[PDB]
Design a protein around this ligand. Structure first.
Ligand SMILES: *[C@@H]1O[C@H](CO)[C@@H](O)[C@H](O)[C@H]1NC(C)=O
Ligand SMILES: *[C@@H]1O[C@H](CO)[C@@H](O)[C@H](O)[C@H]1NC(C)=O
Ligand SMILES: *[C@@H]1O[C@H](CO)[C@@H](O)[C@H](O)[C@H]1NC(C)=O
Ligand SMILES: *[C@@H]1O[C@H](CO)[C@@H](O)[C@H](O)[C@H]1NC(C)=O
Ligand SMILES: *[C@@H]1O[C@H](CO)[C@@H](O)[C@H](O)[C@H]1NC(C)=O
Ligand SMILES: *[C@@H]1O[C@H](CO)[C@@H](O)[C@H](O)[C@H]1NC(C)=O
Lengths: 215, 365, 99, 49, 98, 49, 98, 50, 33
């Protein structure tokens, strides 16, 4: 069955997509880090769904402004036809199911391996932001839920899990039961500003314009 | 002793620093009780092939690395980021035991930064490999008189292997420009070949079993600790502490620092630890250094007298210990304060001068 | 660290001659201030009247109402420079407070 | 003709910034000072020439 | 208008801040934390790392002392000029032009 | 090279101090050239006589 | 007559030439060429050789910066003397002897 | 190395292979196949001010 | 001194505000003169 189709548009990322680079507390200091970040004022893609496979390209910035219990998770890997190791992340009910064990599965959910990772689900006008990256065989996921279109405000994303998978990922898709935003991360140097409570309240993308290079 | 002379002239000389010594030793580790199953890894019958290398994650247990000598007949460790003797103290977050079988001439391949056929197509280590490599001869188990063909290795690949990547896929290698169509033949090479293992071979081609212990030495919440025993917590006292393998000396106090729940350590501008999280009872502690300061000796010449005064720089007199006058430059001990004002003889601080006057004593004014 | 101190004992007298040079600079600063300002031999105080040929000297003569006996222009000069180091006593007492 | 010292030091990362005041402006300042000295003595230093 | 007096404080503050921030550099060693080096490695392997850190921090301290010596010489020249101006402009009438 | 650049980043902030010192030297040279010559307020010129 | 300004030009040129010629020194490594070291040796040995060359060139550049700072102090003193001479002797008549 | 290769006019004697600068950096090479003489210059660069 | 991008040259002559080199000064549109 191929009931799900989608259309594309382009929009501005603004200053969204800044996560904590490490779980180390720093208060009232400017820290110059260098990691895979979403570039400032980049070109993110708005997908309206009512379905080709998307490229990974060194981490994915994901966002949604829809209602709850609409996106049922994600699928990562290369071929995703129960042949090679396909990472299925099903985020529904009261238990997330993360497995490297491949399974033949259609684009739309209804209504060789044995690794079954389980944890708390990644769920709860409101905007949901995620960052996925794969470094040295480890899958790192950052998330943020905030009440608010991508706003002009500044928000920080917190890490959730570490997954020592070790497979090579180049393609991915999302899962449904409306619209979402897809970004792409690049290796860049950021200047993060920590407030009195140790929250990243501002940041400067160094390689954007010469004023930020001077900063 | 500071001046390296037996004669001291009149004036003020900065000599040394007083420091409050630590009183008690504090060792703190999480109360985990399990034992890490290194016996299943080392005391195994058949290791997997190098193109399908085993990777077992060890977690939530007390790790004792001294039993590996009894478990395996290996001669010595090869540890890169740590020392094998010091492995029984510091606590790790995660540890991964990789396991495979190679021959003897390619053990130098499996090292951080090294290249070769195995290091480029079979098993690649990261540049920053903070772990240990254990390799022992297995000529009595992995060698066969007729040739042990169970162990296979990768020869050809379209690109080099990224670090910590298991290439399990078995397709044909298209050496030529023509499409091989999945059929082996001319310029269509099967990339996996067998080790030839015989007891008649030399030491270079003899089978070696390798277990690689990769430590995830991080600031994440640690769960693979050593066999060290945790002591009790002591606050508001200069103590020598060891928190999760992090050694130091300071005064631990209760702090209202708002750590996020994923954060464990707090750093400073000088990349030094300023605040820690207690692993047994989840409390937040600031680490101030123990009290110190500068010590100056204010004296006349040794031809005059052997009586001195001591100035503690920037120290309130109510906290002076490790007459008494209080200056803006610190606390002065051994000089009487006189309400009269004379010319300056030995300068001390913000408008304070000391001299040797009237029997005879050191006065400050 | 005791091991670091034992290693630093083998590196010579750089660790003492840096202290010697900084002590020389610290003595020279007080020498500079004394040479610039301490030129008069006696502390002459002004007469209580303020009529000097019709010249108004109240903006530069000291104001006795202030606890710090400085002039108006001197207070303007002190306020227009923001010192980064104002506390020298109880600095460890301020450091041990939880901030 | 082979390689010289200025190109060697330029290729190795050692540059020489130009001065802010050119020699024409320096000569203009000296000509102004000389003309003021000749036509007015020392009065142009004290006030108006 | 008060540029030089602010520059003195700014130079001293940024010199001390640079000297403090030099403690975070690894200088080629495996760590910038001496207690981490001592608790991680054994004695013979730790000697080289502690030697590299000691050499780097001593070089940074010598750089700071040399900068302070040059700045103190400049400040002494300015103080001699100020003492000359106090002796000639205040304590008498000066016929020197400008 | 790149590995040399990475080890130079590990050595810290010596290069920024050297660059700041050379910039201060250049600005001081410009200040000296301004201070010696730029003393007259107006650019005087000689009469034709 | 122009030996002072000629000495200024010669001092700056000689300092820059010495800084250029310091690049050919081995500084305790096996070669003075980073590309040759990286092509011959592997990563672990090349890191040590590159570290030795970085330390040597950093020491040479620090020596050049220190010499330029001292020469800048001397030139600034001479420029202040020239400004005083221009203020007192060109813009007025000086009664100071010699 | 990394640079711009240029046809040159430097007269190598036939036993020579390379030609170097003052700082012992190679700036003239011989092609091993066609025996030409090539100058090597660094690529274009410069300071950036804001 | 080099190539200046983003500053429009003007035929006037003002006092120096931001120096560049060889008698060129820029000031705030950003003009150079
Ligand atoms: C994004 O790219 C598309 C074409 O690739 C372009 O039409 C659109 O204007 C771009 N949007 C932004 C915000 O740059
Ligand atoms: C930190 O959080 C507290 C919580 O009430 C708040 O009062 C304080 O203003 C915060 N500090 C900031 C935002 O700098
Ligand atoms: C390994 O396991 C076997 C299984 O019985 C046991 O007999 C032996 O003692 C163990 N240890 C070694 C070092 O072989
Ligand atoms: C470990 O320590 C914590 C706090 O000291 C305590 O709450 C917990 O019950 C302990 N666990 C065990 C198994 O003793
Ligand atoms: C020492 O510190 C206490 C802290 O409250 C303060 O009250 C006291 O005045 C200080 N001592 C002196 C001599 O000022
Ligand atoms: C001089 O002028 C000042 C103006 O600030 C005034 O306050 C002061 O009273 C005057 N003194 C006399 C004697 O007129």
């Amino acid at each position: 069955v191929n009931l799900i189709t989608r259309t594309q548009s382009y929009t501005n990322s603004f200053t969204r997509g800044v996560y904590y680079p490490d779980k180390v507390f720093r208060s009232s200091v400017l820290h110059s880090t260098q990691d895979l970040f979403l570039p400032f004022f980049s070109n993110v893609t708005w997908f309206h769904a009512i379905n080709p496979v998307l490229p990974f390209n060194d981490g994915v910035y994901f966002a949604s402004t829809e209602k709850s219990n609409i996106i049922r998770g994600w699928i990562f890997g290369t071929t995703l036809d129960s042949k090679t190791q396909s990472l299925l992340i099903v985020n529904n009910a009261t238990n997330v199911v993360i497995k490297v064990c491949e399974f033949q599965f259609c684009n739309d959910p209804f209504l060789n391996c044995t690794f079954e990772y389980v944890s708390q689900p990644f769920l709860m006008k409101n905007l949901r932001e995620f960052v996925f990256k794969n470094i040295d065989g480890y899958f790192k996921i950052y998330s943020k839920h905030t009440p608010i279109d991508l706003p002009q405000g500044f928000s920080a994303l917190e890490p959730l899990v570490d997954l020592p998978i070790g497979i090579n990922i180049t393609r991915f898709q999302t899962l449904l039961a409306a619209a979402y935003y897809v970004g792409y991360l690049q290796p860049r140097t950021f200047l993060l500003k920590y407030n009195e409570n140790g929250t990243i309240t501002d940041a400067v993308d160094c390689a954007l314009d010469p004023l930020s290079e001077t900063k | 002793c500071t001046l390296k002379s037996f004669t001291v002239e009149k004036g003020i000389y900065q000599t040394s620093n007083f420091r409050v010594q630590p009183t008690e030793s504090i060792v703190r580790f999480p109360n985990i009780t399990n034992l890490c199953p290194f016996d299943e890894v080392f005391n195994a019958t058949r290791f997997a092939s190098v193109y399908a290398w085993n990777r077992k994650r060890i977690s939530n247990c007390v790790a004792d690395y001294s039993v590996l000598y009894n478990f395996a007949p290996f001669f010595a460790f090869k540890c890169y980021g740590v020392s094998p003797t010091k492995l029984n103290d510091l606590c790790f977050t995660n540890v991964y035991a990789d396991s495979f079988v190679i021959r003897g001439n390619e053990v130098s391949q499996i090292a951080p930064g090294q290249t070769g056929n195995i290091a480029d197509y079979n098993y690649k280590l990261p540049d920053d490999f903070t772990g240990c490599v254990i390799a022992w001869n297995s000529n009595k188990l992995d060698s066969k008189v007729g040739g042990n063909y169970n162990y296979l290795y990768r020869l050809f690949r379209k690109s080099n292997l990224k670090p910590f990547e298991r290439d399990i896929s078995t397709e044909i290698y298209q050496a030529g420009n023509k499409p091989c169509n999945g059929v082996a033949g001319f310029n269509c090479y099967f990339p996996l070949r067998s080790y030839g293992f015989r007891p008649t071979y030399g030491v270079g081609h003899q089978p070696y079993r390798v277990v690689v212990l990769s430590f995830e030495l991080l600031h994440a919440p640690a769960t693979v600790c050593g066999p060290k025993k945790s002591t009790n917590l002591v606050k508001n006292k200069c103590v020598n502490f060891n928190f999760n393998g992090l050694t130091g000396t300071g005064v631990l106090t209760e702090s209202n620092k708002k750590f996020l729940p994923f954060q464990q350590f707090g750093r400073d501008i000088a990349d030094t630890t300023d605040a820690v999280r207690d692993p047994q009872t989840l409390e937040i502690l600031d680490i101030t250094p123990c009290s110190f300061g500068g010590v100056s000796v204010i004296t006349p010449g040794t031809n005059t007298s052997n009586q001195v005064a001591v100035l503690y720089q920037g120290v309130n007199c109510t906290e002076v210990p490790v007459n008494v006058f209080q200056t803006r430059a610190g606390c002065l001990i051994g000089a009487e304060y006189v309400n009269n004002s004379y010319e300056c003889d030995i300068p001390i601080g913000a408008g304070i001068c000391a001299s040797y006057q009237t029997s005879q004593s050191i006065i400050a004014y | 660290s005791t091991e670091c101190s034992n290693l630093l004992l083998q590196y010579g007298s750089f660790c003492t001659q840096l202290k010697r040079a900084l002590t020389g600079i610290a003595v020279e600063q007080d020498k500079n201030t004394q040479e610039v300002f301490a030129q008069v031999k006696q502390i002459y105080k002004t007469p209580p009247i303020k009529y000097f040929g019709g010249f108004n000297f109240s903006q530069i003569l000291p104001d006795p109402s202030k606890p710090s006996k400085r002039s108006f222009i001197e207070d303007l000069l002190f306020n227009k420079v923001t010192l980064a180091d104002a506390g020298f006593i109880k600095q460890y007492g301020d450091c041990l407070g939880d901030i | 003709a082979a390689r010289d010292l200025i190109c060697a030091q330029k290729f190795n990362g050692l540059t020489v910034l130009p001065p802010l005041l050119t020699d024409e402006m320096i000569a203009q300042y000296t000509s102004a000072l000389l003309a003021g000295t000749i036509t007015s003595g020392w009065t142009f230093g004290a006030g108006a020439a | 208008a008060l540029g030089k007096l602010q520059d003195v404080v700014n130079h001293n503050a940024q010199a001390l801040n640079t000297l403090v921030k030099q403690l975070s550099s690894k200088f080629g060693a495996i760590s910038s934390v001496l207690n981490d080096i001592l608790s991680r490695l054994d004695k013979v392997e730790a000697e080289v790392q502690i030697d590299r850190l000691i050499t780097g921090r001593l070089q940074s301290l010598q750089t700071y002392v040399t900068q302070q010596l040059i700045r103190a010489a400049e400040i002494r020249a300015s103080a001699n000029l100020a003492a000359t101006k106090m002796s000639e402009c205040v304590l008498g009438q000066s016929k020197r032009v400008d």
